[PDB]
Structure formats: structure tokens, C-alpha cells
Design a protein around this ligand. Structure first.
Ligand SMILES: [Cd+2]
Ligand SMILES: [Cd+2]
Length: 31
């Protein structure tokens, strides 16, 4: 939910398109 580079999300994470916390292969669990 908190997103950093360890989240596998965008940095900073823009909430929408850069938020691969869903359908995520990079990372989403507790991210
Ligand atoms: Cd994110
Ligand atoms: Cd995330």
C-alpha cells in the first residue's frame, strides 16, 4: 500500500496507472 521501489511500483507511485499493486508480478502484498 505504501509504495516505494521495494513495492515494485512506480516511484513515486501515482496511485493509478503506476500502481501495480493489482495484477502485480512485481509486488503488491502489503505494498
Ligand atoms: Cd503502488
Ligand atoms: Cd504498491
Amino acid at each position: 500500500a505504501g509504495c516505494d521501489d521495494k513495492c515494485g511500483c512506480a516511484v513515486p507511485c501515482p496511485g493509478g496507472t503506476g500502481c501495480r499493486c493489482t495484477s502485480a508480478r512485481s509486488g503488491g502484498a502489503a505494498g
